[PDB]
Amino acid sequence: ATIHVDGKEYEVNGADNLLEACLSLGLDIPYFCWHPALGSVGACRQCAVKQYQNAEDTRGRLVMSCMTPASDGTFISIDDEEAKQFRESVVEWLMTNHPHDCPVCEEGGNCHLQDMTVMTGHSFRRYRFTKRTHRNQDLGPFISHEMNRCIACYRCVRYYKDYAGGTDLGVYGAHDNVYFGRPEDGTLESEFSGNLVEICPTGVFTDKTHSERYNRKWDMQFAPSI
Amino acid sequence: FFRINFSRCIFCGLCEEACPTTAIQLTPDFEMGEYKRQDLVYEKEDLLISGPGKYPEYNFYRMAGMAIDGKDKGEAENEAKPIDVKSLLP
Amino acid sequence: AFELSAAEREAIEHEMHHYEDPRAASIEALKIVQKQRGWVPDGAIHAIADVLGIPASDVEGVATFYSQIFRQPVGRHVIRYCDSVVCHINGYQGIQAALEKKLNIKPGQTTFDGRFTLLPTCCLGNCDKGPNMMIDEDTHAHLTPEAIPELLERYK
Amino acid sequence: MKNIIRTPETHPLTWRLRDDKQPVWLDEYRSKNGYEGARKALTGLSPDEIVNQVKDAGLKGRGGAGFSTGLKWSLMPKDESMNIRYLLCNADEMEPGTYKDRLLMEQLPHLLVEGMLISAFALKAYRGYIFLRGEYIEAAVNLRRAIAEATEAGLLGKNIMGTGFDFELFVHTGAGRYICGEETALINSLEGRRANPRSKPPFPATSGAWGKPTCVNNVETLCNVPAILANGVEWYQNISKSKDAGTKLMGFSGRVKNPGLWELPFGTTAREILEDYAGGMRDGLKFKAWQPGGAGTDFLTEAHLDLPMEFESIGKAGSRLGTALAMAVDHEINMVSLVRNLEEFFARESCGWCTPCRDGLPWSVKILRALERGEGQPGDIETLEQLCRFLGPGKTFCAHAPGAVEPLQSAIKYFREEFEAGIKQPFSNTHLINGIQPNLLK
Numbered sequence: 020a021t022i023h024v025d026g027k028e029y030e031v032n033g034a035d036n037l038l039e040a041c042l043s044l045g046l047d048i049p050y051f052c053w054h055p056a057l058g059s060v061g062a063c064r065q066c067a068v069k070q071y072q073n074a075e076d077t078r079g080r081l082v083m084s085c086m087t088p089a090s091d092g093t094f095i096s097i098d099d100e101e102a103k104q105f106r107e108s109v110v111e112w113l114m115t116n117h118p119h120d121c122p123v124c125e126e127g128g129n130c131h132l133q134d135m136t137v138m139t140g141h142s143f144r145r146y147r148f149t150k151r152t153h154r155n156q157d158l159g160p161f162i163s164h165e166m167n168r169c170i171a172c173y174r175c176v177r178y179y180k181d182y183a184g185g186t187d188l189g190v191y192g193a194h195d196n197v198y199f200g201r202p203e204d205g206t207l208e209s210e211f212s213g214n215l216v217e218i219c220p221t222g223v224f225t226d227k228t229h230s231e232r233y234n235r236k237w238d239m240q241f242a243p244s245i
Numbered sequence: 246f247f248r249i250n251f252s253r254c255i256f257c258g259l260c261e262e263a264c265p266t267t268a269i270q271l272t273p274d275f276e277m278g279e280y281k282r283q284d285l286v287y288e289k290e291d292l293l294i295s296g297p298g299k300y301p302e303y304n305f306y307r308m309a310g311m312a313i314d315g316k317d318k319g320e321a322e323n324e325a326k327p328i329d330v331k332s333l334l335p
Numbered sequence: 336a337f338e339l340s341a342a343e344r345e346a347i348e349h350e351m352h353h354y355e356d357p358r359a360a361s362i363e364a365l366k367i368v369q370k371q372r373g374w375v376p377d378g379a380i381h382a383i384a385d386v387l388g389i390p391a392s393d394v395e396g397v398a399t400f401y402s403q404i405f406r407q408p409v410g411r412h413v414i415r416y417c418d419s420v421v422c423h424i425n426g427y428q429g430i431q432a433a434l435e436k437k438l439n440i441k442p443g444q445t446t447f448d449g450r451f452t453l454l455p456t457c458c459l460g461n462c463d464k465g466p467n468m469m470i471d472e473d474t475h476a477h478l479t480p481e482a483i484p485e486l487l488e489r490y491k
Numbered sequence: 492m493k494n495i496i497r498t499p500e501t502h503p504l505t506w507r508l509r510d511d512k513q514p515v516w517l518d519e520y521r522s523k524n525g526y527e528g529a530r531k532a533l534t535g536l537s538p539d540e541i542v543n544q545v546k547d548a549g550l551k552g553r554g555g556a557g558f559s560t561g562l563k564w565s566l567m568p569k570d571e572s573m574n575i576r577y578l579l580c581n582a583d584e585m586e587p588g589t590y591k592d593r594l595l596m597e598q599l600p601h602l603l604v605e606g607m608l609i610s611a612f613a614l615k616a617y618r619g620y621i622f623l624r625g626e627y628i629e630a631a632v633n634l635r636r637a638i639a640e641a642t643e644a645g646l647l648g649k650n651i652m653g654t655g656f657d658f659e660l661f662v663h664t665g666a667g668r669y670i671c672g673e674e675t676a677l678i679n680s681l682e683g684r685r686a687n688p689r690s691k692p693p694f695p696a697t698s699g700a701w702g703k704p705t706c707v708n709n710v711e712t713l714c715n716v717p718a719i720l721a722n723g724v725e726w727y728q729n730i731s732k733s734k735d736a737g738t739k740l741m742g743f744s745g746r747v748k749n750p751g752l753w754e755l756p757f758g759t760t761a762r763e764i765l766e767d768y769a770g771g772m773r774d775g776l777k778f779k780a781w782q783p784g785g786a787g788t789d790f791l792t793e794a795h796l797d798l799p800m801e802f803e804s805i806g807k808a809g810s811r812l813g814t815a816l817a818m819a820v821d822h823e824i825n826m827v828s829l830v831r832n833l834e835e836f837f838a839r840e841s842c843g844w845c846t847p848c849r850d851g852l853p854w855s856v857k858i859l860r861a862l863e864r865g866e867g868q869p870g871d872i873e874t875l876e877q878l879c880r881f882l883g884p885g886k887t888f889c890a891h892a893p894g895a896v897e898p899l900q901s902a903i904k905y906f907r908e909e910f911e912a913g914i915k916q917p918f919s920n921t922h923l924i925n926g927i928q929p930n931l932l933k
């Protein structure tokens with residue numbers, strides 16, 4: 020298929036969505052709820068681009084790139100001012116309730132929310148009201164739970180339930196008090212519960228074993244091993 | 246632990262600028278000459294003073310959402326009380 | 336700790352007859368347990384999940400998603416006064432003040448004797464006859480703040 | 492206007508109502524030409540012929556959006572391997588200012604049963620569910636009694652009218668969420684899940700309830716169906732000289748002399764509804780605003796009162812016809828407190844799925860509480876306008892938040908003075924830190 024991103028012509032797979040196609044081309048689009056292994060749902064509303072009907076269309080329409088197929092003759096703009104404004108707005112709405120926790124958060128320096136907050140260009144707070152807070156759960160020896168840092172992107176439940184087949188993690192509640200966790204305190208039962216520490220784009224689910232002897236990601240010496 | 250190699254330190258103040266709790270500070274004192282270079286490595290017992298230094302009131306843990314002793318959930322600044330997910334209110 | 340009664344289980348299974356997937360009876364099962372006990376307790380989530388063959392995480396998520404499935408203990412009668420825009424225009428705030436000053440509780444609370452639980456609800460679909468209230472199953476329309484102490488005396 | 496004679500030709504939905512507001516049961520219903528449309532459908536019409544007849548009659552969706560019902564019915568798949576089809580009646584009706592379905596299912600439940608029967612025969616739907624809100628106790632009782640009576644009378648179950656068509660009707664009472672009225676979220680709640688909506692395409696016509704083809708229709712649309720099939724297409728297009736065929740339950744509510752609900756042809760102006768049927772406003776109250784179709788629609792002024800209650804006319808005025816149950820705001824009602832109440836409802840009835848509604852309606856609620864308390868700060872009205880802009884159609888997952896912010900933008904557009912009078916404090920969201928000099932942005 021042929022797409023035109025900001026006037027530049029690209030050749031992509033027409034069976035892909037625009038978010039994965041544009042990420043494969045090195046273009047940067049902020050996203051939270053999409054995962055390459057979990058598919059697209061359109062929850063977080065972060066990946067907005069502006070789609071035009073044809074080359075000679077100026078007004079466009081904001082579409083969600085993870086839920087839009089990368090069909091032939093597609094015309095999108097990532098760097099449109101309205102699309103950029105809306106992506107910054109989505110980051111801002113997530114930031115309204117987010118705890119002031121980065122120095123005492125194991126995800127810091129490794130945080131996808133930190134990266135996307137910086138990438139959208141949002142650094143000025145104009146929200147003056149209170150933040151919602153949540154109690155934490157005890158998820159066993161491996162996973163540490165901090166529900167304050169959640170951005171309600173539904174990646175954990177999608178992974179743990181639809182992908183890993185686990186049964187003891189869910190989403191509870193409603194409008195802005197949605198809670199992601201177990202129905203009660205106890206150890207997470209799935210053998211693949213550890214991948215929540217990399218599926219979750221925030222510091223809600225963290226490596227408790229690493230949190231015992233924590234160091235930031237830039238301080239690690241890494242090697243490729245088996 | 247916390248250690249600073251003062252034989253390497255250029256006293257540029259970037260650490261104090263980067264501290265988000267205002268724990269680390271550069272104080273107006275320059276008498277730090279030493280006989281041995283190993284004694285220029287200052288551990289935490291050589292750095293932790295008994296007061297707030299140049300910032301007399303700031304407390305990062307009064308602003309953080311993480312629960313510590315003496316500050317439960319919702320007790321920090323600009324924070325609502327935790328609404329239970331089993332609440333009767335809509 | 337929690338044991339489903341026989342009538343509850345039979346009602347849940349008879350509800351499960353009506354649907355293609357037994358998960359579709361989760362709301363009705365929660366309402367059956369709630370009608371039997373006033374509220375859905377903690378062990379009821381696992382009991383309903385065992386009966387229906389779905390995880391307790393989904394039953395808990397359904398119970399906490401819906402506002403009329405009470406996951407905390409309530410009073411013997413649940414007063415539900417309408418909050419919405421037409422009852423706001425018709426003056427539900429006087430009704431709320433009368434209810435609070437008679438029951439000595441805020442919305443979302445239960446009286447000390449366990450007799451009433453005060454709750455604000457959304458529109459009751461009775462907007463031309465507002466302001467509207469719902470005690471346990473009965474809808475009361477054309478409310479006035481002077482009728483509250485008489486209307487709450489027929490719910491012992 | 493007390494002199495309202497309800498003939499069956501001009502009032503097809505409410506002519507068989509009783510004076511004492513008791514429900515009309517099966518013998519009384521069949522006495523007043525009941526199940527004649529069902530008999531004609533099931534004894535002399537093909538299902539595709541009924542679909543084409545409803546499409547030619549111009550029946551639009553009476554649930555607010557105004558989509559054509561024949562076009563919705565024609566979008567079911569033609570594959571004969573899919574024969575587990577479902578027909579759903581959206582009896583949720585959770586919109587504030589909407590009370591028409593309660594009247595229809597409390598006093599004429601057999602009208603709904605006959606409409607579901609005809610529509611299920613047209614759609615070749617083997618099963619039918621009435622997704623009813625849990626607060627409609629008497630509607631649930633009457634619907635279950637009417638379903639039992641129609642089953643005992645051979646109008647439901649197996650081999651209806653000798654045709655061989657099997658149709659089973661159930662009543663599913665909900666557990667109180669406004670988002671459950673959304674058709675995809677209605678399907679999700681019917682499946683026993685959390686009532687988060689679904690993205691479309693796929694539409695429920697091809698992949699709906701339990702994956703099977705599904706048709707969700709309002710109570711009033713299915714109540715319109717039997718009159719269409721018992722009197723014909725020409726009668727249905729010859730009762731109103733408007734682009735919207737048929738009659739609609741309209742009505743004014745809120746501090747009018749006669750708050751209520753009347754069945755009127757399309758093209759009836761809101762002024763004559765308000766003055767003749769509702770009687771005008773009460774004593775010592777001045778008309779300042781009105782919402783044409785429920786809590787999710789734009790406010791309109793007194794100059795808009797002369798517009799005919801159609802989809803196209805109100806659409807050109809900056810609002811939507813909606814459920815056509817208008818609400819009148821008198822001069823004593825502060826617009827900021829009213830819009831605060833609306834946004835509080837819309838924020839706490841969010842399903843939590845998508846970020847703009849979930850985390851941008853509470854921000855508007857807190858701003859409106861501050862403006863109501865006189866604690867507003869500069870930036871608040873512009874923040875409300877940006878919230879209206881970025882919660883519009885296509886920015887959120889479903890249409891809860893566009894309809895949520897429609898009253899907000901209409902009130903800021905017309906009654907901006909009250910919002911501006913809410914602002915009294917200088918802007919500050921940061922306290923002073925002692926040793927650090929603040930960056931004084933100009």
Ligand SMILES: NC(=O)C1=CN([C@@H]2O[C@H](COP(=O)(O)OP(=O)(O)OC[C@H]3O[C@@H](n4cnc5c(N)ncnc54)[C@H](O)[C@@H]3O)[C@@H](O)[C@H]2O)C=CC1
Pocket residue numbers: 552554555556557558563566583584585586589672673674694695696707784787811813814890894
């Ligand atoms: N209690 C009530 O009656 C309430 C009514 N509403 C009204 O509901 C409306 C919003 O509802 P939506 O679900 O967003 O309506 P919509 O405009 O998305 O579609 C309405 C109907 O047409 C069908 N449809 C639309 N386009 C279609 C297509 N291309 N292919 C197949 N089917 C298609 C949908 O499946 C649905 O049944 C507003 O007009 C609002 O006023 C809103 C809240 C409460």
Ligand SMILES: Cc1cc2nc3c(=O)[nH]c(=O)nc-3n(C[C@H](O)[C@H](O)[C@H](O)COP(=O)(O)O)c2cc1C
Pocket residue numbers: 551552553554555556557558559560581582583584585586669670671672673674675707708709710712889890891
């Ligand atoms: C948030 C939301 C809530 C809705 N609630 C209802 C409802 O309670 N009842 C209803 O009939 N339609 C409701 N709708 C409209 C439905 O999506 C759908 O248009 C309708 O139920 C069936 O279409 P119809 O008008 O052709 O009958 C709602 C839509 C939205 C976006």
Ligand code: SF4
Pocket residue numbers: 117118119120121124125126127128130131132133168220221222223
């Ligand atoms: S989740 Fe990310 S943004 Fe939030 S406190 Fe942790 S590091 Fe900071």
Ligand code: SF4
Pocket residue numbers: 168169170171172173174175176199218219220221223224
């Ligand atoms: S806990 Fe993490 S993965 Fe789950 S919804 Fe919240 S931010 Fe997303």
Ligand code: SF4
Pocket residue numbers: 249253254255256257258259260261
């Ligand atoms: S950052 Fe701090 S410790 Fe490092 S050289 Fe500068 S003043 Fe010294």
Ligand code: SF4
Pocket residue numbers: 670688840841842843844845846848849887888889890891892
């Ligand atoms: S707009 Fe978004 S969060 Fe709000 S009810 Fe719809 S899908 Fe749910």
Ligand code: FES
Pocket residue numbers: 038049050051052053060061062063064065066083084085086
């Ligand atoms: S990544 Fe597309 S909406 Fe979340």
Ligand code: FES
Pocket residue numbers: 417418419420421422423457458459460461462465466467587588589
């Ligand atoms: S607004 Fe209260 S009954 Fe509708």
